[PDB]
Every structure is written in C-alpha cells, then in structure tokens.
Write an enzyme that holds these catalytic residues in place. Structure first.
Site, PDB file in Angstrom:
ATOM      1  N   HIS A  61       0.849  -1.017   0.064  1.00 21.92           N
ATOM      2  CA  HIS A  61       0.272   0.167   0.158  1.00 21.92           C
ATOM      3  C   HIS A  61       0.989   1.597   0.049  1.00 21.92           C
ATOM      4  O   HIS A  61       0.092   2.364  -0.163  1.00 21.92           O
ATOM      5  CB  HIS A  61      -1.207   0.233   1.469  1.00 21.92           C
ATOM      6  CG  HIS A  61      -2.095  -1.001   1.049  1.00 21.92           C
ATOM      7  ND1 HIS A  61      -2.847  -1.882   0.012  1.00 21.92           N
ATOM      8  CD2 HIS A  61      -1.601  -2.799   1.970  1.00 21.92           C
ATOM      9  CE1 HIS A  61      -3.481  -2.542   0.818  1.00 21.92           C
ATOM     10  NE2 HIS A  61      -2.440  -3.014   1.903  1.00 21.92           N
ATOM     11  N   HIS A  91       5.872   7.368   7.051  1.00 23.80           N
ATOM     12  CA  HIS A  91       5.047   6.663   5.391  1.00 23.80           C
ATOM     13  C   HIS A  91       4.687   7.444   4.186  1.00 23.80           C
ATOM     14  O   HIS A  91       4.614   8.496   4.982  1.00 23.80           O
ATOM     15  CB  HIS A  91       4.028   5.490   5.048  1.00 23.80           C
ATOM     16  CG  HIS A  91       3.270   5.829   5.753  1.00 23.80           C
ATOM     17  ND1 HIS A  91       2.594   5.429   7.271  1.00 23.80           N
ATOM     18  CD2 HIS A  91       1.640   6.274   4.862  1.00 23.80           C
ATOM     19  CE1 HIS A  91       1.500   6.125   7.918  1.00 23.80           C
ATOM     20  NE2 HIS A  91       1.230   6.066   6.273  1.00 23.80           N
ATOM     21  N   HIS A  93       2.364   9.034   1.351  1.00 25.44           N
ATOM     22  CA  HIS A  93       0.970   8.957   0.141  1.00 25.44           C
ATOM     23  C   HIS A  93       1.520  10.019  -1.038  1.00 25.44           C
ATOM     24  O   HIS A  93       1.929  11.210  -0.723  1.00 25.44           O
ATOM     25  CB  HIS A  93      -0.105   9.064   0.621  1.00 25.44           C
ATOM     26  CG  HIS A  93      -0.789   8.771   2.379  1.00 25.44           C
ATOM     27  ND1 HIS A  93      -1.239   7.219   2.230  1.00 25.44           N
ATOM     28  CD2 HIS A  93      -0.849   8.739   3.090  1.00 25.44           C
ATOM     29  CE1 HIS A  93      -1.331   6.779   3.061  1.00 25.44           C
ATOM     30  NE2 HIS A  93      -1.334   7.526   4.076  1.00 25.44           N
TER      31      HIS A  93
HETATM   32  N1  LIG Z   1      -1.868   6.785   7.197  1.00 23.91           N
HETATM   33  S1  LIG Z   1      -1.930   6.728   8.568  1.00 23.91           S
HETATM   34  O1  LIG Z   1      -3.149   7.413   9.192  1.00 23.91           O
HETATM   35  O2  LIG Z   1      -0.902   7.530   8.996  1.00 23.91           O
HETATM   36  C1  LIG Z   1      -1.763   5.161   8.864  1.00 23.91           C
HETATM   37  C2  LIG Z   1      -1.222   4.518   7.809  1.00 23.91           C
HETATM   38  C3  LIG Z   1      -1.078   3.009   8.895  1.00 23.91           C
HETATM   39  C4  LIG Z   1      -1.091   1.528   8.389  1.00 23.91           C
HETATM   40  O3  LIG Z   1      -1.191   2.091   6.593  1.00 23.91           O
HETATM   41  C5  LIG Z   1       0.518   0.276   8.399  1.00 23.91           C
HETATM   42  N2  LIG Z   1       0.222  -0.637   7.575  1.00 23.91           N
HETATM   43  C6  LIG Z   1       1.081  -1.622   7.260  1.00 23.91           C
HETATM   44  N3  LIG Z   1       1.018  -2.509   7.209  1.00 23.91           N
HETATM   45  C7  LIG Z   1      -0.673  -2.214   6.687  1.00 23.91           C
HETATM   46  C8  LIG Z   1      -1.366  -3.477   5.191  1.00 23.91           C
HETATM   47  C9  LIG Z   1      -2.674  -2.866   5.967  1.00 23.91           C
HETATM   48  C10 LIG Z   1      -3.129  -1.434   6.838  1.00 23.91           C
HETATM   49  C11 LIG Z   1      -1.860  -0.736   6.851  1.00 23.91           C
HETATM   50  C12 LIG Z   1      -0.665  -1.260   7.178  1.00 23.91           C
HETATM   51  C13 LIG Z   1      -1.305   2.825  10.397  1.00 23.91           C
HETATM   52  C14 LIG Z   1      -1.685   4.116  11.159  1.00 23.91           C
HETATM   53  C15 LIG Z   1      -1.442   4.451  10.744  1.00 23.91           C
HETATM   54 CL1  LIG Z   1      -1.673   6.315  11.732  1.00 23.91          CL
HETATM   55 ZN   LIG Z   2      -1.268   7.639   5.629  1.00 23.82          ZN
END
Ligand SMILES: NS(=O)(=O)c1cc(C(=O)Cn2cnc3ccccc32)ccc1Cl
Ligand SMILES: [Zn+2]
Length: 257
Positions: A61, A91, A93
C-alpha cells in the site's frame, strides 16, 4: 482485498470497515479561514536525536520506514498532546501526477504527497493496544510540494529499487528523520482516524502548515514502486491516498495567527 483501484479503492472500504462512515474519519479538508486559533496550544516538541531506524518495507500500500520503539528514543509530545508518543514508523501517500497525492487538503489545495510520522501513546504499552484507544496515536503530517530536492529524503529514494514489490524489505539503519522536517513547526490539529483500513478512530492529527520541497526526480522514484508482489503483473504504486472525508461535528484548531 482493499486497495486503491476502481474495484477496491476508498469508496468501497465501508463494506469491510463500516467505521469508514464514522464520526471522526480522516483525512479532511483544512479550511484555513475557519480553523480556530487556540493561544493555549503549546509548541510541538519533536525529539528525534536518538532515533533508531531499522528497516524499510514495501507493504503493498506504501513503504514504511520502521523504528525501534522499545524505548523513548524518538518521541513527540507537547503541542495538543497530553503525554508522550513514540515514533514507530513513517510512510508517504503520493499521486500519479504532481497535482494530487496528499490526503489532507488546505482550502481544497492538493499537494504532491504527504508524509505521516506515526507515534503511539506510551500509556498504552504498545502500538496494537494504542490503536484501540481514542487518544492512542499522534500522527505528524507534512505536505510535500515539487521544487528543489530534499537532501534528507535522498537516502530513502535510493533504496526504493531494492523494495520494488509487495513484501520486500531492506535494512535501513542510521536514517535521521529530522532531515524531513520543515523550518516551522506551526500546525493545525483535530481528532481523526487512520486513513487506511481498519480506519480506527484513534488519532490526534497534527498537520504542519509549512510543506517541504522535494524534486521531480525524487517523487518520480516513488512512482516506480509496485503495489503487486514479484512475478505478478505490474501495477505502479501511485494514487495511494484517501480523499477528504466529512468534518462532521469537529473543529480544526491552529497553533498560529
Ligand atoms: N495513514 S495513517 O493514518 O498515518 C496510518 C497508516 C497505517 C498503515 O497503513 C500500516 N500498515 C502496514 N502494513 C499494513 C497493511 C494494511 C493496512 C495498514 C498497514 C498505520 C497507522 C497509521 Cl496512523
Ligand atoms: Zn498515512
């Protein structure tokens, strides 16, 4: 099952994760004129001097840069927060084009990408317990615009070709996340959720006003990653952002102006 395509993207998530239509979902549009200045908000305290990065992972993702969070080494506190939150991973986006890619928007403006530094509240002992709590996480969100390069990002860009496909990882030690922060720590803040399934309503969002600049070549390298695993058909990892969700009964607070 979930992802970012026509058939399994954000508008579908609510079928597996009904909280997708909940009362405190993220991201949101930040309407800068209606955010309320709160002179009682404190400066954010970002204490990243002792950070221990360990690994970088393509999870299908996005990619995560993971940290040792088994001691207070890279912590967020102050700002709107009451206790101490430990950095576990960051990470991004990003978009298929420079004109989109951010999750939060500012007066409906989309940035090219958005960095999320994820932290969990130490009063809950670990990340998995923290996500079940309404004040479990604090995520520091930083917008990326395309312009001059961000030198402190280049070590991340250069290892991407070693984690091109879903499930690959690489040792990633000695990375200093201070090299990703803008000059100002002025922020907006509001209560929200994870922006990916399981969409849990456990996040205090802190979104910095000042974007960082990255070069067109650095964001191009993000776009060469793959959502698929090795030996599967190539699907470029682009447009892995959730659009703005209804603000509902919430007020966004500003630390400035
Ligand atoms: N995008 S975000 O709100 O910062 C956020 C994103 C995530 C993730 O996407 C972590 N993450 C790592 N492997 C995953 C497989 C499926 C879904 C989430 C996964 C974990 C915590 C937060 Cl706070
Ligand atoms: Zn995020």
């Amino acid at each position: 099952h979930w992802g970012y395509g026509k058939h399994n993207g954000p508008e579908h998530w609510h079928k597996d994760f009904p909280i997708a239509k909940g009362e405190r979902q993220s991201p949101v549009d930040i309407d800068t004129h209606t955010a309320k200045y709160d002179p009682s908000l404190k400066p954010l305290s970002v204490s990243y001097d002792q950070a221990t990065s360990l690994r970088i992972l393509n999870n299908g993702h996005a990619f995560n840069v993971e940290f040792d969070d088994s001691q207070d080494k890279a912590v967020l506190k102050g700002g709107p927060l009451d206790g101490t939150y430990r950095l576990i991973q960051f990470h991004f986006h990003w978009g298929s084009l420079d004109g989109q890619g951010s999750e939060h928007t500012v007066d409906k403006k989309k940035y090219a990408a958005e960095l999320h530094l994820v932290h969990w509240n130490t009063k809950y002992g670990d990340f998995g317990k923290a996500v079940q709590q309404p004040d479990g996480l604090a995520v520091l969100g930083i917008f990326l615009k395309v312009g001059s390069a961000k030198p402190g990002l280049q070590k991340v860009v250069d290892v991407l070709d070693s984690i091109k496909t879903k499930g690959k990882s690489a040792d990633f030690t000695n990375f200093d996340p201070r090299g990703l922060l803008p000059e100002s720590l002025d922020y907006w803040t509001y209560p929200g959720s994870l922006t990916t399934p399981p969409l849990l309503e456990c996040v205090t969002w802190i979104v910095l006003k000042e974007p960082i600049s990255v070069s067109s070549e650095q964001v191009l390298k993000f776009r060469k990653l793959n959502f698929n695993g090795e030996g599967e058909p190539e699907e470029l990892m682009v447009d892995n952002w959730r659009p703005a969700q209804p603000l509902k009964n919430r007020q966004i607070k500003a630390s400035f102006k």
